[PDB]
Swiss-Prot record, chain A:
Belongs to the universal ribosomal protein uS15 family. The lineage of its organism: Bacteria, Pseudomonadati, Pseudomonadota, Gammaproteobacteria, Enterobacterales. It comes from the Bacteria. GO terms for molecular function: rRNA binding; small ribosomal subunit rRNA binding; structural constituent of ribosome. This is Small ribosomal subunit protein uS15. Induction: Part of the metY operon that extends to pnp, also has its own promoter. NCBIfam families: S15_bact. Pfam families: Ribosomal_S15. It comes from Escherichia coli (strain K12).
UniProtKB/Swiss-Prot annotation, chain B:
This is Small ribosomal subunit protein bS6. Keywords: Acetylation, Ribonucleoprotein, Ribosomal protein, RNA-binding, rRNA-binding. It comes from the Bacteria. One of its GO terms (molecular function) is structural constituent of ribosome. One of its GO terms (cellular component) is cytosol. Belongs to the bacterial ribosomal protein bS6 family. The chain holds residues 1 to 100 of 135 of the full protein. The keyword rRNA processing does not apply.
Curated annotation (Swiss-Prot), chain D:
This is Large ribosomal subunit protein uL2. The modification N6-acetyllysine is found at residue 241. It comes from the Bacteria. The gene is rplB. One of the primary rRNA binding proteins. Located near the base of the L1 stalk, it is probably also mobile. Required for association of the 30S and 50S subunits to form the 70S ribosome, for tRNA binding and peptide bond formation. It has been suggested to have peptidyltransferase activity; this is highly controversial. In the E.coli 70S ribosome in the initiation state it has been modeled to make several contacts with the 16S rRNA (forming bridge B7b, PubMed:12809609); these contacts are broken in the model with bound EF-G.
Curated annotation (Swiss-Prot), chain E:
GO terms for molecular function: rRNA binding; structural constituent of ribosome. It comes from Escherichia coli (strain K12). One of its GO terms (cellular component) is cytosolic small ribosomal subunit. This is Small ribosomal subunit protein bS21. The keyword Ligase does not apply. GO terms for biological process: cytoplasmic translation; ribosomal small subunit assembly. The chain holds residues 4 to 54 of 71 of the full protein. It comes from the Bacteria. Probbly involved in recognition of ribosome rescue factor SmrB in stalled/collided disomes; fusion of protein fragments to its N-terminus decreases ribosome rescue in the presence of SmrB.
Length: 88, 100, 55, 271, 51
RNA sequence: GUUUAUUAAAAACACAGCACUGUGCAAACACGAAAGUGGACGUAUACGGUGUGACGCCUGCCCGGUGCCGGAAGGUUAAU
RNA sequence: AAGCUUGAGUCUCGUAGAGGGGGGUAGAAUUCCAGGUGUAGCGGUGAAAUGCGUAGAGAUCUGGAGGAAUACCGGUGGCGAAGGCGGCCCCCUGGACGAAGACUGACGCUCAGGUGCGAAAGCGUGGGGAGCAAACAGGAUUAGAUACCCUGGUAGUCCACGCCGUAAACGAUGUCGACUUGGAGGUUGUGCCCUUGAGGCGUGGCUUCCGGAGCUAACGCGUUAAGUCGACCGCCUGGGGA
């Protein structure tokens, strides 16, 4: 989960167009704000053999929200994959 | 920040150097953003297992609320005179402020 | 409870030879016996009790 | 880092090198450069005194300030550089007065970071703070076996050396040679560590690759004639003797230490 | 409280009853659930005294 | 790659690799009537030496002899 | 195509333990380093050697140091996907579990291939050698003893690590979903109690051992099923030979 001082900085950015913020656009932006934390973490002590299992749990949670959004709205999908560090 | 008891045994013969050592240590810890809650030393205290080959110690306590980023870097202050071993920081088990 | 390093309490849970008394002679639940064993073992690393009364 | 060569064209197959992108390569600071003349493995008495020597490619010498003359001066490390003269590599020290000197490249490889000199200096790595001020348990490098005599003992690559014990006005350290040795504690040392540590992983791969390194091929004693080496060829598979150097010393087990001046500084051997 | 004597000592005092191997730790482990299920036939405690 | 200039052109020698070992620095070792040099502007991932021969399979026994490493009680024993 | 909120995922809040990661650290016994006190023994077997040993072995002690494994606790125990993981401290950190509400609005389940993970032994690049010890030696026992005993000892164990995918990886239970009968006991959430309790009772998760139905040839499984019954992916059809 993410803190109330941090969620409020992301919801105002990925929830501009509409008052209801339930879109998976926000759900993957809030996930990336927590993968940023479990990806670093690494350094100090970059080497690992178990905590990165929690990162590969977030890989499925990310891939699912993108498949769901791509099924939802091709414009809100193609606009979203250009505003985050997605697909190299 | 987190609460730490920071209580070290000290060689029993250093009992009148303790007031200057704890001055030197506290003069580094406030800049490290630590708040002092309780600051004590006893003298004539005993052990059942020998340290520095003695069953006797002075005991010095520096119970603080401090940043978690500086609690092993604390060793740089103990090595600033290198006369004391094992800081024993003891993270959040018990706390008293001044006497209450 | 209330600062665990109380050696007068810890000396009431060991033999004359300093060995940890079995849970059945104190009526102690295993939940507490494991934590009391951890307290007695930690007290050696506080120098309040020898690792064996032999030394 | 360490790299093997691809087996393309004959002779590359076995060649393994050490490589480092974090360390600079180029020309040396000219006021600390000299060509350093060769002996040719011969001395002023007109005879050979060394073997496996001759030729090689062009090389100069980078002058390292191993014997120091002053203290107290603030500095910064301006360069971290490669050195063909030593496995430990080199670093350029810039003192606030506008003065430059070379030192052995510290394990951290970091440039543009300050270091202080003298007994006022902080108990921090790379400071010129002598062993009388340092805690026991610290790492030192280039440990200065005798004070004022400068940088010697434990200065080749991968070294650190830890101070193990105190013995009054002295300190004792432990060596990878199995030796535990006492020093007069006014010694400065490098108050830190030296880099590389990969140099034993190199594989020369080729029969000519020592030739450009000033090395010449040397014949086996039992393959040359009996007039030049105490071995001497036969007769196929002859030997019939105890094995010796070209000068009669038994090649294995037989000892040759004879100093007997400073035994009190050596606390333990073959440890 | 078997041994309890410190300093001066004479004769054997090694062979005792209760605690260590029967009554009521170690040995008899093949009986397993006999250590729990028989309740008031084999277990006095119950609280109010010595836990 | 090296070679017996005019009977051998090589499987030898060298050589990547390897073991065992000496060497704590005023190193061991080498030159040699002895200084001063060379080892090295190197300092134990540095230097010396032997043999075997890169790379892959790997690599046993005998300490009686002789040498080396180590040991000092008992005995032989010189100068004095 | 479009709802719906129940599956699922997200969220509000936190705890114990050998879960993982990076560093800091200590002692018995032993050996080495440096030495003393003292003398024929040590150590061990049904009985005895070799060996260490008078050149001081063993015993005993002062100062220093190394390394494995972390005694007791330790097992009706924890944590975990399996293998497993324990020792003390700190920083970072994975996964589990519940109640009243909030949110998307079937977003879910399984899964050929695909991507991942060793208790050990081994090998590979480089270290390291106290403890123990294959191999081999010395001495015994004996028909012999290639074993046990016993004086030594390499590889390996340890480490920076890499490769492998090895096993009784056997607590023989592939992964998901759901219905049903009792008890003795412990733990962890969560909600209650006319709490005269030194505590009690609901209701989820974990969970030991008996036990009713029913299934199996039989052991037994037994609500954490081998009963009952849907979804997906592999496996089986004599042994010798393989």
């Amino acid at each position: 989960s993410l803190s109330t001082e941090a969620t409020a900085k992301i919801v105002s950015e990925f929830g501009r167009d509409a008052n209801d913020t339930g879109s998976t656009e926000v759900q993957v932006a809030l996930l990336t704000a927590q993968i940023n934390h479990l990806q670093g973490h690494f350094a100090e002590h970059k080497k690992d053999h178990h905590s990165r299992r929690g990162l590969l749990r977030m890989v499925s949670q990310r891939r699912k929200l993108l498949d769901y959004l791509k099924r939802k709205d091709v414009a809100r999908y193609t606009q979203l994959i250009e505003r985050l560090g997605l697909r190299r | 920040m987190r609460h730490y008891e920071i209580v070290f045994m000290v060689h029993p013969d250093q009992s009148e150097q303790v007031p200057g050592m704890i001055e030197r240590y506290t003069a580094a810890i406030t800049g490290a953003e630590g708040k002092i809650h309780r600051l004590e030393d006893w003298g004539r205290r005993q052990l059942a297992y020998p340290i520095n080959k003695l069953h006797k110690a002075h005991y010095v306590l520096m119970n603080v609320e401090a940043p978690q980023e500086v609690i092993d870097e604390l060793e740089t202050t103990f090595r600033f005179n290198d006369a004391v071993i094992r800081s024993m920081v003891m993270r959040t088990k018990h706390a008293v402020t001044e006497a209450s | 409870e209330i600062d665990y390093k109380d050696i007068a309490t810890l000396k009431n849970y060991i033999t004359e030879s300093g060995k940890i008394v079995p849970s059945r002679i104190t009526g102690t639940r295993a939940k507490y016996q494991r934590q009391l064993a951890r307290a007695i073992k930690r007290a050696r690393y506080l120098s309040l009790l020898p690792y064996t009364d032999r030394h | 880092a360490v790299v093997k060569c691809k087996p393309t064209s004959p002779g590359r197959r076995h060649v393994v090198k050490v490589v480092n992108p974090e360390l600079h390569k180029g020309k040396p600071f000219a006021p600390l450069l000299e060509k350093n003349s060769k002996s040719g493995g011969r001395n002023n008495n007109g005879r050979i005194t060394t073997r496996h020597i001759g030729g090689g490619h062009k090389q100069a010498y980078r002058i390292v300030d191993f014997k120091r003359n002053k203290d107290g001066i603030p500095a910064v490390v301006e360069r971290l550089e490669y050195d063909p003269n030593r496995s430990a590599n080199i670093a350029l020290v810039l003192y606030k007065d506008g003065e430059r000197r070379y030192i052995l490249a510290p394990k951290g490889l970091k440039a543009g970071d300050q270091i202080q000199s003298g007994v006022d200096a902080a108990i921090k790595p790379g400071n010129t703070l002598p062993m009388r001020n340092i805690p026991v348990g610290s790492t030192v490098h280039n440990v200065e076996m005798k004070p004022g005599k400068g940088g010697q003992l434990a200065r080749s690559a991968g070294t650190y050396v830890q101070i193990v014990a105190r013995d009054g006005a002295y300190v004792t350290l432990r060596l990878r040679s199995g030796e535990m040795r006492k020093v007069e504690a006014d010694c400065r040392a490098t108050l830190g560590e030296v880099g590389n540590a990969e140099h034993m992983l190199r594989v020369l791969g080729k029969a000519g690759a020592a030739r450009w390194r000033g090395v010449r091929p040397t014949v086996r004693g039992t393959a040359m004639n009996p007039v030049d080496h105490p071995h001497g060829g036969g007769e196929g598979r002859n030997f019939g003797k105890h094995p010796v150097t070209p000068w009669g010393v038994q090649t294995k087990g037989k000892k040759t230490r004879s100093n007997k001046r400073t035994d009190k500084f050596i606390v333990r051997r073959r440890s | 409280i078997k041994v309890r004597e410190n300093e001066p000592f004479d004769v054997a005092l090694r062979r005792f009853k209760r605690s260590c191997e029967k009554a009521g730790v170690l040995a008899e482990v093949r009986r397993r659930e006999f250590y729990e299920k028989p309740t008031t036939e084999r277990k006095r405690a119950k609280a109010s005294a010595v836990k």
